Structures are given as C-alpha cells and as structure tokens.
Amino acid sequence: VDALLDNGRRGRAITGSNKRPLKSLADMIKGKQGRFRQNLLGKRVDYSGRSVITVGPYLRLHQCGLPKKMALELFKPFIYGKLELRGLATTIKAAKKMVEREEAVVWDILDEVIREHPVLLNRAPTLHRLGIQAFEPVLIEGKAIQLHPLVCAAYNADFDGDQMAVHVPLTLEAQLEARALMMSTNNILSPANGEPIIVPSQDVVLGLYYMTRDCVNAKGEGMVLTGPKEAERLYRSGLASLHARVKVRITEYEKDANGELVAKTSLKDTTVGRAILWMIVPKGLPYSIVNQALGKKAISKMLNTCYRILGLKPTVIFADQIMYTGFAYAARSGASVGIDDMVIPEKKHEIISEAEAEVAEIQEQFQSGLVTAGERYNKVIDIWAAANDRVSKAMMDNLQTETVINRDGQEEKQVSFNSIYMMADSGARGSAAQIRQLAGMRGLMAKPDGSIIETPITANFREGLNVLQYFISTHGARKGLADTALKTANSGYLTRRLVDVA
Amino acid sequence: YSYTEKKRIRKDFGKRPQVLDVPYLLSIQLDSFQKFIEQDPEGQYGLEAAFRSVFPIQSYSGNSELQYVSYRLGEPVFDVQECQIRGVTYSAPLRVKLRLVIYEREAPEGTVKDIKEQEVYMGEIPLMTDNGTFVINGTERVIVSQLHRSPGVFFDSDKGKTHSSGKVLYNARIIPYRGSWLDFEFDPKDNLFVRIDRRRKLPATIILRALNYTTEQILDLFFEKVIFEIRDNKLQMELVPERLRGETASFDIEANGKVYVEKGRRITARHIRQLEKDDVKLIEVPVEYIAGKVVAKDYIDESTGELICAANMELSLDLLAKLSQSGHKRIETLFTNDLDHGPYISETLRVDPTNDRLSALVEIYRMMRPGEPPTREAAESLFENLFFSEDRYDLSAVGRMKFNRSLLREEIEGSGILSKDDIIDVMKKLIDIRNGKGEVDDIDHLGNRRIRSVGEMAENQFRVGLVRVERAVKERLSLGDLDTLMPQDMINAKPISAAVKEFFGSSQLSQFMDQNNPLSEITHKRRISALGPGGLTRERAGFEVRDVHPTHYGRVCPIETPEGPNIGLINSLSVYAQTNEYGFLETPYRKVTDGVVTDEIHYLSAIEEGNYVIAQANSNLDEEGHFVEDLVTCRSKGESSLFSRDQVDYMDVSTQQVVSVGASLIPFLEHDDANRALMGANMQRQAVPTLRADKPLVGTGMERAVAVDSGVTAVAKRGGVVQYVDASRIVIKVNEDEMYPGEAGIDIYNLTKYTRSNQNTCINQMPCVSLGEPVERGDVLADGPSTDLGELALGQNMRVAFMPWNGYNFEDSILVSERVVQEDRFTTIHIQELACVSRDTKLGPEEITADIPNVGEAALSKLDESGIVYIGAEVTGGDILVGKVTPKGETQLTPEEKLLRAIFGEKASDVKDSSLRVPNGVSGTVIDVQVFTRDGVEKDKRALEIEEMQLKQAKKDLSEELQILEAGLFSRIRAVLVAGGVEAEKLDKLPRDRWLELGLTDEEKQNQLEQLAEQYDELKHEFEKKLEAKRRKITQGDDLAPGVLKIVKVYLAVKRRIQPGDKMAGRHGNKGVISKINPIEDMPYDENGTPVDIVLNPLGVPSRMNIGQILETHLGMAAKGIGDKINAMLKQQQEVAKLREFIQRAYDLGADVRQKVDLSTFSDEEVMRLAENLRKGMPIATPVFDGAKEAEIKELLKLGDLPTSGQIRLYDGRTGEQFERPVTVGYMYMLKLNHLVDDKMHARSTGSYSLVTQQPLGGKAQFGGQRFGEMEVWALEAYGAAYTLQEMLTVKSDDVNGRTKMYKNIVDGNHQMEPGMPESFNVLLKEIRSLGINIELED
Amino acid sequence: GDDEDSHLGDFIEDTTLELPLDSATTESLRAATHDVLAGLTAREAKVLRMR
Amino acid sequence: GITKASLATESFISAASFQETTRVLTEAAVAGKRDELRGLKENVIVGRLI
RNA sequence: GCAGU
Ligand SMILES: [Mg+2]
C-alpha cells in the first residue's frame, strides 16, 4: 500500500518488468511531469500551428505573414461555416470535401475569414510577455512565417532556424484582447523599463546612420535647397550625394502650450540625407532630432521622443517608415565587409616587440632573483595588458579617422567611412571589443580555472591564430558556451520561483 | 602523379611538408571489434578471454566440470543488405566447443570417468560491417566510444568545500574495473575514514583490523619509533638528527659537549647540520618530554601478567613512573613531528570501537548489511568477497597498471584483486599527501581517463551473459543425472543472446547512425562520449568535466562538440589521435634528437607528454631540420612557453593534429572564432546531398581522406582497366601484375542506387570512371552521396555578395536568386518508406484490396488489381498507396441516419477504409514496393509478380557475373596458350568450351592451365550453389511479428527544391534561413551583367568574428577567376601550349608552397582533361593553420585579372544604378542543412486527443497541437488576456463538452464559448482522492 | 528512445471519442431531417418520428 | 525567501502546484484547509477567468 | 538517447 501511494518514500522503490521504478499515485500529481505542472498549468492546445520564421520586411507593425497551408488548417471550422453560410456548400461534409480538395473558392473564403482576425505568435522560451504578440495575418504562399523585423528584438528571434507557434483566438473576447491588449502596435514600450522595445536594429540603424552622415567634399556640397523634396530629387537624379553638406529650408512644427502645432521655417545647415529623412518624421518633432549621425541610441531616442510628444498612433507609423527608409538606404549603401576593412595598425608589430623585450627584461630580473615569480607573473601580465591597450588605441585611432580628404585642395580628416567602423559606431552590430579582435590583438586569455595565461594571443582574426593560440582561445570559448548552456536552467528556475511568489 | 587525382588537381597552399599521412579514420571501431571477435591464442582479448574468464565451470561438489575447448563464428544467415531489407540483425552464430568432464564418485585426484565434448550454440553476436556500422533490426547503428575514468587509485580533495574553515579535505579512491569502490578520506579533525560503495563512513583502521593487523602492527606500519633507552640519567634518549627539523625547542639538548640551542627557540636546519656533524645520537631530555608522547608497544608486567600500558596510549609522568617499576630499559614511542608527520592513524584508532578482527568485521557487516544479525563465517566471507575474491572484484590490467603507477611501484602487471599492501600503500600515499609530500590527481587529465570502445563493451556484456550462464550450469551440475546429459542440455542461449542483444540494440552508446552525408558517418564513428553506462549523467556533470583540458591537444578536438545540454561530454577524436594498448589516447610526435627534427614518429600518451618539451607544428625549420628561429614556442608541462632550440624534445607532426576531421574541413579555420568554428563543424554534419555534387573551390585537402575512408564511395581494390562501366556496375579487368594464379582476374563493383539513408535522404553511387580508362589501386571508381570525383562535396559553390539588400537578409537571413532554384542546385532527393501492415484483428483479418468502400473510382486509378500502387506512380498527398480495409461491426447508428438509410437505401458496409495514404504535403514517385507475407497466407498477384521479378533479377545478375568472370578466365586461358604453342589463328575458330581439354605441352604453364580449368569448374559450381540459395531466400516466408498477416512497404522518392524557410549555411558557423527567392533581374550584378547568386549580410561577420567566411569568399573569387580564364581558353579553342602555360602559372603561384605540379610530364590529352575539369574554377586547398596567406589570395586575384581588394562595384538589378560602395563579391561554399521548412510546418484545428487527460496529442506525427506551457500562461496573465487564457485552458484542450460546442459554434457563425471544468482537473481530483485525501468543490 | 520527458502514455490517443466534425454533422443532420419531416403531414411525419 | 513565501501562501492549490506537493497536501489535509481560488494559479488550474 | 532554437 505504501508503494502504491508513494513509491520510494520508504526505502527501496518497487521496480517492475523493466527494472525501472513503478510510477505511484503520488508521482502522478507531483513534479515537472505531474498533473499540476504538465497538464493543468500548461497544456497542448488545439487551433495551433508552428513554422520557421523569415523576415518579410514589407509588413506593417501589426501584420505577420501566415502560410496559406497553415491558415487553411488553423481556420478550418471558420471556413466550414462560411462555406455553409454563403451557400457554396450544402452540408458540413460537402464543405469538408471542398476544403480537402482546395477549390478556388475556399481561398476566397479564407481571405474572408482572416481579414480582421488576429493570431498570436509565440517564440518559446517566452521569457516575458512580449514573447506572445498578436498580428493580423497576411496570407503568403510559403511554408514559413514572415515575422516583422521590428518585433524580433522583443522575441529574441533571429532568422537562423527559429520556429514560432501560431494560435488562433476563437471567441470575440479573445479576438478583442488580441486586438486591444496584445497586438504588436500596443507593445512598443517595454514593461520592464519604460523604453521602446519595437526599436530599429542592425540593417535599419546602419541605413539611417549612412544616410545621416556627412562627407567633406561630397558631390553637390554647398547648394541651397527649397526643402526635403528637392534634396530627394537631387539624390535620386544623382546630382548630389547623400552626405553633401547643404542648406535646406526646413519647416518644423512644435506643440504650443495650448496643445496645437505651430510652424517655423528656417534655413538649416544640413546634409542631403538628413533632409531626405526629415520627410518621414511626424510633425511635432524638432529638426535637431535628425540633424546628426543617427546611431542606434539616437534612433531609439527619436522613437521615445515621438511616443512621449505625439503618442502611439503617430509612433507606429514613424517606426514603420524608419524601418523602410533604413532598409532602403542600407541597400543603396552597398555597405560591405571586405578583408581590407580590418586595417591592422602598422604600430602593432613594434608595440609587440617592445612588450616582448620588456617581458624578457622581467625574465632576466627573475633569473637574477630580484623578483619572486609572483610579482614577476603580475608584472608580465601588466606589461602585456599595457601593450594590449596600446595596440587597441593605435588600431582605433587608425580606424576611426583614416579618411583624410581634400576640401579645396587642403587635406582634412573626417570620421571614417570604413564599413567595420560604420557598423561598430552605429551600434548596428559589434563593439570595439570585437573590432579589437579583428584588427588589433586579442590579448590575454584565461586558463579553464580563470588564471590568465601570461603570454597573450598576439594575433588577431585578420591574421591567423596558430595552433597553440587557437587552442588557448578554445579554453575560454567553451567555458562561455557551457555557462550559457547551464545558466538558462538556473535563470528559468529563478523566474519560476518569482512568478509563483508574486 | 595519380590517375584519379590528375583528372583535377587541387592547388595546395600548404607550406609545411607533411610527415605523416592521415590514418584510416575508422580504425578505432574496426580495430576494436576485430580485437573482440578474432581468435586469440594467448587469450587476452575478446571472446577467448571472456571464455577463459569463466570456464572451466566446476560443480559445487567437484564431481563434474564443464571446460572450454574453443569457439567458432558461424556464417551469417543473411547478407548486410538482406538484413537491411528483411529487418533482422546482421549477426553470426557463436558455436562454442565445450567439454563435460565427469569423474568417478571417489577419485584420488579427480580421475575422470568420461569426457563428452560437443559444439554447443550460445547466442548470436552482431557482426560489424566493413565501415564500422552494425545492422541491428535493419537499421545501421554505431556504438559510440566512451571516455570513462580509468580504473586505479585517485587522490583528490575538496578545497574547503566543507566546515567553512578553508581546510582542504583529501580523499583516496580505489575504482576497480568491475567491483566495489573503496574510499579513504580526512575529516575536518584529521581522522582517517573509510567508505565502501559510498555508504556511511567507518574509521579507516577498521579495515586494517579486518586484515589481521593488530594495533602495534598498525602503528609499526604507519609510523617510525623514537626509542628512550632510559639509562642512569633521566630518560637517556636515542636520537637520529633529522627528527629535529623545524620545531620550537623549549628544552635544551646536552650530550657530552655543547648545549646546542637554548630553551624557548625555534631551530633551523643548520642546527640539525650541527648536531649531525658533531655526531650526537644519544641525548638527555627533561622528565616532562614524555608527557604527550604516545606509546608504540603493548607494555606488560611479567610479574603479574597484566599489561601495564596498552599501545596507542598517551604516556604520562605517573604512567611512566608506573611502568618504570617493572624494570623496562627501552621505551618505544611513535615519532610524530607536526607538519612533517601525522598523528592521523593514532587519533583514528582512538575513535574506532573495534579492537580485534572479529569486531571490525562485524562493524563492516553492520555498515554493509544493516539490520541483519552478523555471524562469524558470514562477516568473514562478506569482507573476503568485497575486495579479495577474483569473481566479485576486478582491478583489471589497466587498473593494476594505473594502480602501480600511482604508488610508484616498479611492476606494471599484477593481480586483479586487492591485497594488504595495496590498501596500506593507498593509505600511506594519502597520508603523504596530507603531509605535503605529494599532490592530488587531476581527474579529467586524459591520462586519468580512457577509451572503452565497441569491442570492449561488447565483451563486457558477453561476459555478463556468460556468468548468468555459469550460475545455471553450477545449479545443474549439482544434480544426479550427470551420467546421461550432454553439455548442450545445460546451456541456455537466451541469457547470452539477451545480454548482447540489449547492449547492441538498446544501449545509450549504441546509437542510430547519423547518415546525412559521408562526414556525418565518419564523425559519428570517431565519436567519444563521457555519458553511457559507467559514465556521467548530463545533468550532474559540472563545469569542469565539460572543459578543454590542456591534455586534449592532439587527442580530442577542442572545437567539435555539441551545443546543447551535453557539451564537452560528447567529444570528437582528433585526426591523428590513436588509442594505447590500454585505451589511453595517444598522439604522434616527431623526435628532435639534436635539433634535427627527425622524421621518426612516436605516439605519446598524455602522461608522457608532459615530461617532454614539444615544439609547435608552426615552428619554422630548414631542409636540414634545425629550427631557424632560436626561441621555439613549445608546451612543457601543460603550459606554453619559449625554449631554446636545444631543449626541444619533440615536435607536432602536423598543423591539423589538434582538430577533428570535421573541423579540419573548415578552410581558414585560423581566422574564425572558436564559437563559430564549433557551429560550422557541427553544421557540416547536417548538410544533405544535392542532386549533382559540387566540389569546394576552397577546401582544406581532407576532402579525399574523408570521402575515401567513409565507405560511401567505390574504391578500386586492385588496379586495372575499366572493362565495362554502367550506372549500376563497374567491371574492372585487373592488371596482370596484381592477379593471383588460378583466378579470373576481374573485379565487379555493384553500385548502390537510390536507397534510403537513416535520415530519409538518398544515398546513390554514380560511376566516376569511363569505359576503357586505366585505374589504380585505391582510385575512386564510383562516387557516393556528397562526393565529386572522390572528394567530399557537401554543398555548392554559390556566388555571394556581402551587402544588405532591402532588409531581406535581416538578422541572418539569406536572399537567394531564382537562378539557384532554376539550376536545381540545392534540390535534394529524399526517400521515405511507408508501411501498410495488414494485421489479424479479432473481428477477422484485414485485407489488402482494391474495392475500397465509399471512395472515388479516380482514387483507385493508381492501384493495381491487387490493391497496391504501381511503381513509377506520381502520387500527391492523400492518394491511396495500399488499399486496405478492416472488418468492423456493431454499427448502432442514430435514428436520423437510420431514416436516411430507409429513404435512399444505401446500406453501410461491414468494412472500414484503413488504407495507407500519402502524408499531406508529400508528393513524389513510388520507386519500390515490398510485400512481406506470413508463411501460410496465400500470396496475392502482386506478391507473386514481385517474386518473379526478384527471381529473374537474381538469376540474371548471377548469370551476368558468371559471364563476366568466365570471359575473363577465357581471356586468361587464351593469353597463357599464346605464351607458348600459339594457336592464335587456330584458337579463334575453336569454341571457348573446348579450350580446357586442349592439352598444351607442359613446360610449367600446364599447372596454370590446370588451375584455371579448376577455377572455371568451381565457378560453374558456385554459380548454381548461389542461385539455389537466392531462389530459396526469395521464395521463403517472412518471420513477421505475431499477429500481422502481411506488410507492404512503399518507397516514395520526393524531390525537395529550395524555398523560403530552408536552412542554409556555410562552413564558418554562418547559418541562415532563406527569406526570399528573388528573380534574376532583381539581383545585383557586376559590370559584365553576371548577377549574384546569394546576398549575405555584412553585419553577420564583425560581431561573431568568423573572418574565414570573408577569406573563403575572397579566395573563392580567385579560384573561379582562374576557371573563368581557362573556360575562355576552352572557348577560343586555344592551343594546348597556352593552356599548359597558364595552368602552370596557376599551379606555381604561392610563397614556397609544398606541392609541385609539373605539367611538363602531362600528355596533351591529360592537360586537356585537366583544363576541362578546371573550367568551373580551380579547386584550391587551404590546410588548417598553414593555409593561404592574404598576400597569396591577392596574388591569385591578380592572376585571374580580378580586383585584388576582393570587391567590385555592383549595380542594383531593379533600378540599374550603382551601389555607392564596392561590395565583397566572391564564391562561398553553401550547404543546405537538413532543417527543411517542409518538415517544420505543421498546423491543426482539431484532431486526436490524449487518452487519460483529454488534451491534444504531442507532435506533428500525431497531428500535434502546440504546448501552451507555463511561461506562455504567464505571458497571457501579464496582459489582461483573461478570455484568451481561459479558452486556451478550457475549450481548446480539455473541456470535452466545451470544445465540441466551440466547434459547432464556430461553424454556426457564433464565436462564443461555454467553458466548463477541464478534464485534467477531474483527473487530478480523482488522483488525489485515490490517496486517502478528500478534496472537494464547495458551493 | 530513452527520452524521459516523453513516454508511451502520451502517444496513445482516445479512439472512442467522436470527431467534432462528426458532432456537427450529427446536429446538422438532426436539423435537416427535422425540416424535411416538417414538410409533411403531421400524422405521417409523426408516424416516421414514432417508428 | 521567495520559495519559503511561495510555499507559505494561504492557498494550498498554488503551493501544491509550485513544488513539494506532498508536504503541502498533507499539511492542507490534516489542517482541513480551504482554498477560495483568489489568486491567478488557482483560477488557471480550474479553468476560470483569472 | 540524438539534434534544432
Ligand atoms: Mg535563432
């Protein structure tokens, strides 16, 4: 009886006919596989599909792309009822056969039944509430869902094989919550901090950064424009480059104290690209919001300013327009990473030779007993870290300003248009912590226990790492990978405990 | 040069001259299993050792014995392919010759009465195919090698993990191969404790008292005695000087001379030097010097017979004055010098309750079997069977070797059981380590960790079976019928066969083979796994066993490891890595004798790798051998440093010594991050083979080794000339130099055509050679899947451009042009078997029939009259493949359809349509149909048709191979006959059957004619012997599962084209999902109008620093740039001199490259064939860590008239205007990975629900339903989505009355729910009430 | 396949259940039969409902 | 702690659902407890509106 | 068990 109620609670568990312990009554209801957690708090669910996600950058913020062959199964009783209702089927058996044969009329019915019907898209692990958002489906012909780019950061979703589940809200209350509470246009701020989470990202930020920069002697510099439309005309006609410093007549509106928009027209010292980008900025925002090279944070501040000043309905339009224009002018950019983009500073070899000479003198000071191996080790580490910082500073000083170009004959240095630097400086992808490993040196690596090896990787990834340097780097690479693979099961357990306390 | 590798020569940019060729990559599996099954005369390995481990089996009394003469392996009943078709294990029967020796009742020495020897059969053992795989129940399985802890003794510690006091607690652990663990440890107060099988701890001296040591013997073993020969002067004390090392002397030492050190001082080693140089050995100490000293001997009073002082008792002044009355001159005392020597054993003996052998044995018994009353001969048999019985404990040969090597003994060989001195030496080394005189072992050192492979695990399981048989034979030889039985009446084959069967089929290490491409197989066979029986568990393995130890260098790849929960537990054997005779990974090194790096190679294991200084493979050296630099970078003890040229002992044998065969295929591995290299090495093994294999324009040179060492290709066994080439077979006329006497001299190679892999891909061999061309030994004759002219081709060389394109490559997406779908580049064939099993239900048999009820007549158009589909039939989803019906009854239809039957009259049928249909979305061709019919069931017309087809094919193939072989034999006869006594114009008229009896004059060649005629006659006999066996295997019944009548297997062949969603990748960790298939006119294009095949993202390079994917691109631009020149010279039909000149310029290019391709020796036809194979880009070889420098890539770009920066100006396809910056355009080698969106997409509205809980079923095979788990419920609770949540809980999963109402409301146009209680909650209330608990619902 | 999170128990479906398409078919057949018997004389329509 | 406070709620359905089902259910049984379905988990368990 | 995110 005690093995029936709780097997293994008193002494040896009874094991039958597979040499595996029998599952008792208490084991049915407890644990991660018990009723309480596996069947009652979460459960398998009808009307639910799943597929790979792809970009679909043509979408609006409230739209997803839903495969026709997924939406024809997810909405089967809706199509059966609309075939019965519209007279196209005399029965539910006739409508079932019509959907099964996939006639040309069930696709018109399917276009009818999904029209204003949201679906919830979910990427597990659902770490926070923005891991489930509603979207209106746009029927596409693929087999992969087309997830809007701006919401990817909310889902923590890249398109490298991620799958997402689609759920259909059936009732009018469920549809109205998908539309009012969970729709992705309602979700543009984060609930953890009040900052935007529907926010532009790597390609978008790089497009808007490349458009809003300035070059010194660019084509079409110095002219005076009647506004943003003439700037777009000049750029598309190829009569002026996107970076030509120019004078544009800008009309900007500010919300007065009474609450309406009062205008002001002034000649702004601008570039052609910021003039072009001004065409998508809604009215109550100032010109100082685009008259700068727009990195990731400047774009996020643009969106936050628009949300506070104008509200949600102008902000979703602004976010979609920002995404379209960033994608467009990153495509026109031809921004490409070659191997010459990773310029190694020509001072790297002599800085490394100086540090090698210095560690040789600390080694002869150790051989002559002046210093103990502890202080010798520490001094070699510090005169390798000083050399690493020297190499990184020389690399970044070479990489950020290598553009020296001619204004009326006089050479003049400007911020570099290098692609690796344009990606890092945008905040599109990467930081100087990776540019330093591409074009600098990648420095002191640690042992598996944490004690850093006294001789560093004096190479970078543009040059090769030899067999020993590569093995030494794998030491820390696999440690990071194992901590990543073993701390998700700890952060999820902390989140579970916090949810069940609060 | 070669003949298969001068068709197309891969230009090598490698610079270090290779000294050791890559070994046979599957020698781990094959060598291990060969050691298992092969005959061993000395009885060390495999089956012979397992038999001698158990046999001879003596009876309980000794009247009879069962001994073992020899064993044999039978012939397998079915071939590998017949076992894959009939779904049976490919095994061989184990025929063991046993001998029952029976004596008379009372014999002087066991003089025998009779001997009865016969060949018993015990089990079948699965054989390993010649590629390292096992065919087990038809599926090919790979037994993955295991990295487990070597048996021995390991000293370790916890570094203040206990008592919060920073006291490191040491522990020794004896791990046997088979047996019981034995632990010693220190507690926070330095009492030595013992554990057995990790149960609660005893004092460690209890096991010393279980052995017959008394207390004074224990103190004699673990101590050294200080002796007080108490002379006239108070406690005259004998002394050796070094005992005075490092203590605070509060007493002065005076002995015929100086007072050496004043009282109240600490003394130094120079004072000991003083005391030993003035030669004082006998001193005068104060009276209280004995207060605290522990006696060593049991001091007894011979006057009264009473022991006046027991051993291990602290002597005091009152006790000293007590025993001084007895007239005792010498007082022995345990010498305990703190911080050099320990009281540990004495203070341990102060804790244990036992004082003799029986009390200690009783305490060990109460520890081991608690609650069972111990008797003397029960406890003293339990302890003797724990560690000291050779059938219940084994410290095996590797265990004894590691055991003696730890304790620094001289012998490497010994007994498998423990001894007194083994346990004493383990305790002694633990005490030494506590005293700072040693260091604890590193548990994940690869010299403390060893490889247990298929042939050792299988022998272990076979020995488990043999002991399960030995117990039964001992239970049988204790009976009185011993004069009538034979030894096969005693052996049940089912224990042995069940042990071996469960190991090979259902173990954790016997894994379903990953058969995607050749690389997947060849790296699943070289797999090492810390998991498994006797290993770790992935949930309880810490961060430290998952790390890259410094000893994996050359033995285990640091890169190639999984990414999920088991990372660093599944390892991949590196390229040159080998195993010891004990199972310790060893790696090859070139000896450096005097600075001349000798080409002599020595395989060093991990323990002997640290004694030496080992130079890098990247260390420069001249043709002489000396290191041209003077401070060589080397590895001395596990750390890396610079050494002089004279110190260096060994050198690495190659630069790919450190990485596995999967990571050695990544070009420019030295420029990728190790994370991205891990991802690329893991994603190469997932690429599916495309229609036409395309070599890599940038490769590493390991392609040929991987493609040849995997058995996917057809490699010529003997050189020759291709007599006949055909898509289904290659017939090679062997050279005269390579054929034996009395042999046809013809090798036939039958090619695998369109068969199913384990992963439902197509494996298909295409002949590579042409008719009449010469082949050599080792030349690839026919390709395999993912193989191009004998190289490993896992993908296609797509022309990529690195630029952002309108957001369609956002966040690792891939833009693909329509000319990749047009040219069928990543179209892959996938073969699926689908089984229709006509069973015997209890209502009657299900029948395979074509008259299916209530189905259209057009649906049965593709079925033949027997109910099965035609071969070649193009089927789409839903189509009937095998028409089947199950008999049903007890209809009991509702009154409304009863009236419906009454009106229209269509009477329902007694059968139900249970036919096999194509799954939805699947569309392909039926390429094979197999019908397995149970013996006794009459075969339908289709089964008899398939059988006549099989018999015609078997007879035709056997007759055709006989015609081929007999034609070769007659050609050889004709060649011998014209070597002397030539009838060449007479023999052409004489028919071929008359040449045998043509007597030639016998100089010597009449012996050749004898042997060739005998060969022909036995060929004719073997043809019939094979044909009758093929006929009886075809027409015989099938051993199906009980209950099933017949099985029809339909093999669909689907062609999956590339489409948005399909996961594509490169070799550098740059995965991505195709996001659009773009038209050709929408792609960017160069000044010549060539559009770009694939547009990748530049933003995926700089943060995840896989720079290799850039260089591979820049070099793939160069390679193809060479080809686009040769192709041009092949279009103007240039003279072969200009082609020879340009190809020699392309092969000479590079900075002191190791290869020399001299086209001066190529004939003009060979130059033309080479240039025709190079017109699609010249294949380049960039070996790992000595590959092509960027300067050489720029020089190759200059040679092909390309921009040396690797970047051209592109134009937009849609608007025709130039992209503002130069774009990196080149040729990246892309791979289509097996994560296809066809197999991912799934949706359900409703369907089948689960049985106990009424929730939907699991996955897309059971029609799915997505788990709306716990975190998603928190997501809907964080919004105020109370109704969405409620309908996810009630009317979509569990509300049984509510989900049908929901369906009928959605259909009737009313989107409203009526939720009730979820049925899982009713299951929960019924399961809580089945405990004694009353849970209710109140109201 | 040694997969602990799955078992044999959650691949076994409940075959005795009725498909909600068949429940909708039954209720639709009830409605259709009720109308096409409402298109008759009450006497004979009740004879059919009664028989 | 968050565990010792999750397990000490006045609602035995939430606490038994969280972890240590056996201890919570025996304490609730011998205490003759009552759970009024006031939080969110007890209304998700029984399929109600939260 | 093995992979994917
Ligand atoms: Mg992803």
Author numbering:
A (entry chain D): 303 to 804
B (entry chain C): 3 to 1341
C (entry chain F): 512 to 562
D (entry chain D): 1308 to 1357
Sentences from the paper on this structure:
Here we report one crystal structure of a multidrug-sensing MerR family regulator EcmrR and nine cryo-electron microscopy structures that capture the EcmrR-dependent transcription process from promoter opening to initial transcription to RNA elongation.
Three additional structures containing RNA transcripts longer than 4-nt were determined from the complex reconstituted with a full set of rNTPs. The structure of RPitc-5nt sheds first light on the time point of EcmrR release from the promoter following transcription activation. As the growing RNA transcript reaches 5 nt in length, the stress built up in σ factor and promoter upstream DNA eventually leads to the disruption of the EcmrR-σ70 and EcmrR-promoter interactions. In addition, the upstream edge of the pentanucleotide RNA transcript stacks tightly against σ3.2 loop. The stress-induced conformational change in the σ3.2 loop likely has been transmitted allosterically to the promoter-EcmrR binding interface and led to EcmrR dissociation. This in turn releases the kink and under-twist in promoter spacer DNA, which relaxes to adopt a B-form-like DNA structure. Whereas the specific interactions between the –10 element and σ2 domain are maintained, the conformational change in spacer DNA extends the linear distance between –10 and –35 elements and rotates the –35 element out of the angular range for σ4 domain interaction. Although the HTH motif of σ4 domain still inserts into the DNA major groove, the 2-bp register shift significantly weakens its interaction with the –35 element, which likely contributes to increased promoter flexibility and less well-resolved cryo-EM density in this region. We propose that for transcription initiated from the EcmrR-dependent promoter, EcmrR dissociation and the accompanying promoter spacer relaxation demarcate the beginning of the promoter escape process.
